[PDB]
Design a protein around this ligand. Structure first.
Ligand SMILES: [Ca+2]
Ligand SMILES: [Ca+2]
Ligand SMILES: [Ca+2]
Ligand SMILES: [Ca+2]
Ligand SMILES: [Zn+2]
Length: 317
């Protein structure tokens, strides 16, 4: 739409009030955010299995209805993700060229999913038991949007070690996005949307992958063919290494000095963008992470040493 930049208000999935960037055109306001380097659009599929649906239009610039909630969050959190990338690394959208961010909410009926489809963000509303509206969790959004960035860089193949690395990368960043918005931060993934009645859980944990049965050491990796070679479980190995590099700890007899989330982020960003390839394995991830740290802090630096220490802890050389 073409119009005038407005600022509205609405309530998200968890019931919190949020500030919205919309556009006034004719008699209505549209969930269209013209404020950033990339345009952000939010759509309504009206509980159908169609894409992208209808661009979202409101009569008064107030998004306080129960039906509004998923759209308010989808809208807000994508602008927050753009922000994280723009401020931290000077990245202009998913492709470094201002590609627009599109999201469809109310997709299907009681659909327990949300993913980047290679072109836009897709959100279902959940069954209200296993999940709630999928747009209410910032780390899951940051995770999927980061998949858009890998595709525009390393392009890690979704199978075996390189696929797990892909998954790991996306968790690291979604976590980073959550800390970014001071969105009650932690190292678990999906706790704001998962099993709305049970407090305590998440889909997986970076601090202790074994809580959910994921491996936390190379010697314990899944070796078969299921899940494109165990893509979603083996990522726990890289997740654990990332956690120890940011916060420190003792793991399998190896003591790691943490360097903080900001350097963890710069090291992985640099690694994924200049060093990783489509088929980077965990051993090459170590070497590339090591080179990134050397470039960033110096070859004989304490950072580089932490990098080495962190992989050692998880059995990767
Ligand atoms: Ca309204
Ligand atoms: Ca949290
Ligand atoms: Ca989290
Ligand atoms: Ca829960
Ligand atoms: Zn993923």
């Amino acid at each position: 739409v073409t119009g005038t930049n407005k600022v509205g208000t609405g309530k998200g999935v968890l019931g919190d009030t949020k500030s919205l960037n919309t556009t006034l055109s004719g008699s209505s306001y549209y969930l269209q955010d013209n404020t950033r380097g990339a345009t952000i659009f939010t759509y309504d599929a009206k509980n159908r299995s169609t894409l992208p649906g209808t661009l979202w239009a409101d009569a008064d610039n107030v998004f306080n209805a129960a039906y509004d909630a998923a759209a308010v969050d989808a809208h807000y959190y994508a602008g927050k993700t753009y922000d994280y990338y723009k401020a931290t690394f000077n990245r202009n959208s998913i492709n470094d060229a201002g590609a627009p961010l599109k999201s469809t909410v109310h997709y299907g009926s009681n659909y327990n999913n949300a993913f980047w489809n290679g072109s836009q963000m897709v959100y279902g509303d959940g069954d209200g038991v296993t999940f709630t509206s999928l747009s209410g969790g910032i780390d899951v959004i940051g995770h999927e949007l980061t998949h858009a960035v890998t595709e525009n860089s390393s392009n890690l193949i979704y199978q075996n070690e390189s696929g797990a690395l892909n998954e790991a990368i996306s968790d690291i960043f979604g976590t980073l996005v959550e800390f970014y918005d001071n969105r009650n931060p932690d190292w678990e993934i999906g706790e704001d949307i998962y099993t709305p009645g049970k407090a305590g859980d998440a889909l997986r944990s970076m601090s202790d992958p074994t809580k959910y049965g994921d491996p936390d050491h190379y010697s314990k990796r899944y070796t078969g063919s299921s899940d494109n070679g165990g893509v979603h479980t083996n990522s726990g190995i890289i997740n654990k290494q990332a956690y120890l590099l940011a916060n420190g700890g003792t793991h399998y007899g190896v003591t790691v000095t943490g360097i903080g989330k900001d350097k963890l982020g710069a090291i992985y960003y640099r690694a994924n963008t200049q060093y990783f390839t489509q088929s980077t394995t965990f051993s090459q991830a170590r070497a590339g992470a090591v080179q990134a740290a050397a470039d960033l802090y110096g070859a004989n630096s304490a950072e580089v040493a932490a990098v080495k220490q962190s992989f050692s802890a998880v059995g990767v050389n």
